[PDB]
C-alpha cells in the first residue's frame, strides 16, 4: 500500500542540470504516518521492496528528461544542491525519467541497493535520500511553475537480519563484462550545423571528474580490474528532445582520432540511429582491445572511442534554438575479448609510513580499513581497486591478511626495539587481550590478520563506534625505521553492500 | 553492400519547386571506391538492382515533400536546374519522399528503368542521374540549413548481355 | 642421439648490477624483458637461450619468476636501507599500487614475479608504450651493495610469436 | 583473389649477393586498392593466409637462384641494401627460387610466420617486408635487364583476435 509521499517542484524554465530537490525516504514514510509507518514501529527493522512512482503529466513537446538518484548513503547530496552535474547524479543507482512517457515507476530492493535494514526510531548509518535533477532541459520554458508527486509503495514486514545480501564479493579475476547503472552524461548536437561529430571515450576505467573533483564509482572501479577489453558494446540510445526535433546518427567505433574522409567512414561497421533504441557496435582497435586506463599524457581519444556522427539533422521548426541531446547507456560488452586481470590474487599496498619524527609512535587501526593521517610522520596511502571498492559501497565486511615490511634508518648493529602489533577485543581502555605480537625490529618483517567489521556485521565508510576487535601498531624506536610498509590481501568472501560513489 | 553515396543540401526555407541538386549514379559509386566499385572494374559491365536509401530525419511538423527523379538518359536536367516544375520532375520514373515518414527507400531494377548495362570506364550513352527537387514546401522556414544522405546499395555482378528486357 | 639439455628447468641470470656510484638508484623494468643501460652503475647482461629466443621472435608473452640476490660492500653491522620492488599497474605517474615489496638490505635476497606482456597480449622486442603492470627496483643505499643479481625462471607457457633474427 | 602486386628489377648481370629490392606487403595491398584492400578497411584487422606468386620466365641456362626472405619485423633490411649476405637473408623465414623452375609459389600463414594481425590504417609494430636477393649468380650476364612480378593472393576476412598461435 501507499507508504509515504512527497512533492518535487519544477520551475517553468527547467534548464539542464537544475537541482529540483531531495526527498528523505524515511521522512516520506514518517510524515505520512501511515498504516505502513505504524507497522514499522512494531517491526522495529524493515528491509522493504519499494515501488517508487513519480506522477507526472505526460508531454511530448518539452524534451525534458529528469534523473532520480538513489543515494542511500548520502554521498552526492552536498555536491548537487546548487547545480547538479550529471557525473554526480549518475554515479549512484539511478533512473531516467522521460517527460514523453509521463508517470514513471521502478522497483528498489532495499536489500540490494542499500544493504542494511531500516530502524524505525532513527537513522542507523546515514539517512537514505532520493535526489531529483534535470538531465536535459526544456526546449523553451513552459507556461508556469508546476509540481510532480513522488510515492512510495511497500508492504513492510519485520526484517529477520540486519544485513542484506552482498551486492559484490571481492575477486580480482572477476569482471564479467556486464554493467548496471552505466549512463554517460548527455551529448549535445547544435542545429546550426549540417553535420557533426561527438566522441564518447571507451577507456572505461578512467575516473570521471567534475572540475578538480574525482568521482570514484563502481563501474570505473570494475573496469580497472582488467588491463583492457575488446568486443562489442551493447547499449541504448535515448533522443531527449520534443517530437518536432529529429536527427539521424551514424554510430561507429574509431581508433586514435577520426577519419576525415566520409567515404572511408561508411566502410566501417557502424549502425544508424533515428530514434530511441538499442545498438551494438564493435570496439575497433589495432589490438582488438582498448586499454582500461590511461598513462601519463595520454588522452581518451588516443584509443578506441564510440563516435556519434550526425549525418542528417538535427532539424526543428523555426524558431527553435535548443540543442538536441542524446543520452547513451552502456549495458554490456558482449562477446568480450578481455585482457589479463590487472591484479592477481595477491597482496597490495595499503599504506607506507615514513619520515618518523618521534621514537614513540602508535598507529591506531581498530577494526577499519581507511586513510591514515599523522602529525608526527609521513603517511602515503595506496591506490588500488580494492580501496576504491571500499569507497564505492555503503558497507563492507571481511578479513584482511597483513604483511608488514620495514627497512632500517640507523646501522643494523645499533638497532633495538620492535614493531609491536597490539590485538584487543574492545578498546584500549577496557579491552581483552588477543594475539598481540612483538616483532623485534631485526626481524624486518611480520604478519597478522585484521578483522574489518564489528558485532553488527559490517563497517560504514566513515568513522563509527561499534564494539569489535581492535588493532594498533606500536613503534618504540621509530626514528630507526626508514619505512614501514603495510600490505594486505583480502580473504575470500570480502563483502560489499550497497553500490554508491565517492567524490573527493 | 553500400556501393555509393552522395549528399543533398536542404535550405531552411525549402520552397515548392526548389532544385536541391543532382547526384550522378556512376560518380557516387566511383568516388566511394568502393568494394562494389572494384568488383565493377573486373566485371566490366553491370546491370545492377539498386536499393536507394535516403537518410532523412522524420518530421511531422513541416509539410515537406520531395521528389527523387530517376533520369537515366539526362533528359530533364537542363530544364530543372534554376527551378524545377513538377511537370518535368514527374515525367520520368520518380518517387515521393514524405518528410513525416523519415528515411526513405526504394528499388531500382536498372534492367527495367534504364535498359542498358553500365561500363566501368566511361558513360556509354548518357550519364544516369538522380534529381532531388521539392514538390511541396515547408509551412514556415526551419531553424537552419541541413542535409540528407543518399546511399546506393547493390551486389554488383558481371552482366551477361548489353540490353535489358524491353519496358514496352 | 641427443645429449642432456644444456639447461634444466631452473633459474638463469638476467642481469648483474654492480659498481654503484650513487646511493639513490632506480632501475625501471616496467613490463619488459630487455637489456639494461646505466650511466650511474655497471650493467652486466646474461647470455642464454631464453634471451636469444626473446631476440629471435617478433613478439613474446609470459610470466617470469625473479630471484634477487645481493652481497654487501660495507660492513654488515653498519648496513641500513633496502632493495625495494615497486609494483604498479599503469606507470609511475598515474598507476595503481600492487604487491610492492620492501626487502631490508640485511635480508640479502628477495623474490618477485614479473609480467612480461600488456593489455594487447604480447611485447615486441623494442621499446613500446602499452598499458600494463609496471615494475621497478629502488636502491636507497646502493653504494653499500657490491652486487645485485637478478635471476629469472619463466613460468610454463611462456610464448613466442613469429620466428625472425637479430643482428648485433 | 589478387590482393596486391609489385615488381622486382633484375640486372642483366645478376651476381651472387646482389640486392634486388624490397616490397612492403601492406603497400602492395594498399597501392593496388584492391577488392581485398577495401574488404580490409571494413574488417579493421586481418590475419591472412597469403599465396605469394613470383612470375618469372623459366630458364635452364643461367644458373640463377634467388631468395625471397619474409621479414615481418624489419630485422635484416638495414644490413642488406648495399649487399645481401646469405647469412642475413637465410636467418629469417625464406624460400629458394630456382630459375630453372620458372614461376614460383608458396603459402604464408601470417598467423604463424608473423603472429599479430594487420591494422588497415597503419603499421602496428613494424612494417612487414619481402626481400629479394640473389643467392647464386648467373654463369654469364644475360642479354638485357628484365623484371619479375610478385603477387599476393588472399581472401581477407576479419580477424577475431590480435594474436596468432605461438610459434614456440
Swiss-Prot record, chain A:
Source organism, top-level taxon: Viruses
Disulfide-bond pairs as recorded: none
Localisation: Virion
The protein's name in its UniProt record: Coat protein
Amino acid at each position: 500500500g501507499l507508504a509515504g509521499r512527497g512533492v518535487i517542484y519544477i520551475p517553468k524554465d527547467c534548464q539542464a542540470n537544475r537541482y529540483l530537490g531531495t526527498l528523505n525516504i524515511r521522512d516520506m514514510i514518517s510524515d505520512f504516518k501511515g498504516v505502513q509507518y505504524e507497522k514499522w514501529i512494531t517491526a522495529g527493522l524493515v528491509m522493504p521492496t519499494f515501488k517508487i512512482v513519480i506522477r507526472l503529466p505526460a508531454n511530448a513537446f518539452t524534451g525534458l528528461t529528469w534523473v532520480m538518484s538513489f543515494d542511500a548513503y548520502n554521498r552526492i547530496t552536498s555536491r548537487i544542491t546548487a547545480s547538479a552535474d550529471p557525473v554526480y547524479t549518475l554515479s549512484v543507482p539511478h533512473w531516467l525519467i522521460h517527460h514523453k512517457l509521463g508517470t514513471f515507476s521502478c522497483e528498489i530492493d532495499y536489500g540490494e541497493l542499500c544493504g542494511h535494514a531500516m530502524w524505525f526510531k532513527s537513522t542507523t548509518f546515514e539517512s537514505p535520500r532520493l535526489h531529483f535533477t534535470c538531465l536535459t532541459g526544456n526546449n523553451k520554458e513552459l507556461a508556469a511553475d508546476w509540481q510532480a508527486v513522488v510515492e512510495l509503495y511497500a508492504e513492510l514486514e519485520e526484517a529477520t537480519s540486519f544485513l542484506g545480501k552482498p551486492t559484490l564479493v571481492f575477486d580480482p579475476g572477476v569482471f564479467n563484462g556486464k554493467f548496471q547503472f552505466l549512463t554517460c552524461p548527455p551529448i549535445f548536437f547544435d542545429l546550426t550545423a549540417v553535420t557533426a561529430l561527438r566522441s564518447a571515450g571507451l577507456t572505461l576505467g578512467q575516473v570521471p571528474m567534475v572540475g578538480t573533483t574525482k568521482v570514484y564509482n563502481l563501474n570505473s572501479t570494475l573496469v580497472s580490474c582488467v588491463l583492457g577489453m575488446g568486443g562489442t558494446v551493447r547499449g541504448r540510445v535515448h533522443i531527449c528532445a520534443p517530437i518536432f526535433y529529429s536527427i539521424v546518427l551514424w554510430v561507429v567505433s574509431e581508433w586514435n582520432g577520426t577519419t576525415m574522409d566520409w567515404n572511408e567512414l561508411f566502410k566501417y561497421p557502424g549502425v544508424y540511429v533515428e530514434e530511441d533504441g538499442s545498438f551494438e557496435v564493435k570496439i575497433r582497435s589495432p589490438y582488438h582491445r582498448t586499454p582500461a586506463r590511461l598513462l601519463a599524457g595520454q588522452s581518451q581519444r588516443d584509443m578506441s572511442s564510440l563516435n556519434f556522427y550526425a549525418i542528417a539533422g538535427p532539424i526543428a521548426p523555426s524558431g527553435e534554438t535548443a540543442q538536441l541531446p542524446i543520452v547513451v547507456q552502456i549495458d554490456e560488452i558482449v562477446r568480450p575479448d578481455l585482457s589479463l586481470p590487472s591484479f592477481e590474487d595477491d597482496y597490495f599496498v595499503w599504506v607506507d609510513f615514513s619520515e618518523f619524527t618521534l621514537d614513540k609512535e602508535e598507529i591506531e587501526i581498530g577494526s577499519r580499513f581507511f586513510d591514515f593521517t599523522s602529525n608526527t610522520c609521513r603517511v602515503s596511502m595506496g591506490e588500488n581497486p580494492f580501496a576504491a571498492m571500499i569507497a564505492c559501497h555503503g558497507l563492507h565486511s571481511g578479513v584482511l591478511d597483513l604483511k608488514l615490511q620495514w627497512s632500517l634508518n640507523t646501522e643494523f648493529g645499533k638497532s633495538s626495539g620492535s614493531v609491536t602489533i597490539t590485538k584487543l577485543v574492545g578498546d584500549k581502555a577496557m579491552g581483552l587481550d588477543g594475539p598481540s605480537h612483538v616483532f623485534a625490529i631485526q626481524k624486518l618483517e611480520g604478519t597478522t590478520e585484521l578483522l574489518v567489521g564489528n558485532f553488527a556485521g559490517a563497517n560504514p565508510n566513515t568513522r563509527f563506534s561499534l564494539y569489535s576487535r581492535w588493532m594498533a601498531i606500536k613503534l618504540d624506536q621509530a626514528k630507526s625505521i626508514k619505512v614501514l610498509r603495510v600490505l594486505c590481501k583480502p580473504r575470500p568472501g570480502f563483502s560489499f553492500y550497497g553500490r554508491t560513489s565517492f567524490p573527493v
